[PDB]
Amino acid sequence: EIARGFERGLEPEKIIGATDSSGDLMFLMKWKDSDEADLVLAKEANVKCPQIVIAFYEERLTWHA
Amino acid sequence: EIARGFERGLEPEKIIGATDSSGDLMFLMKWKDSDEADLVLAKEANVKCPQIVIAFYEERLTWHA
């Protein structure tokens, strides 16, 4: 029954990693005043904390030709 | 001559590219039901249409080889 995820109901601080190994893209979300980070579906974080997602991407962007 | 930009009042469709060229980050925004695309400041697009911004970055996330 222990269903920690986006449902843990804590407020997001920043995205600390990302992985799409399963068919769906997921962010390793860090929460405020917690040290248990877990995965959230990207499509949810896009809709629930859009600036947290955008902040993750802006740092980490590079230019190819 | 300010009669252009986000003021064009059209609905954003998608981002076509980005550049650090003017020294500040800007998206080339295509507008809906038009085919004249112009530039938009990044900080505005984040706040005004974050789902368009996120979609643009997401399609380009990688871990390499």
Binding site: A18, L28, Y57, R60, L61, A65 | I16, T62, W63, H64
Partner: peptide
């Protein structure tokens, strides 16, 4: 083992 590995957003300079 792409998690725990820094991710890049690859953006083109010329176009899309």
């Amino acid at each position: 083992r792409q998690l725990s590995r820094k991710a890049s957003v690859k953006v083109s300079k010329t176009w899309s």
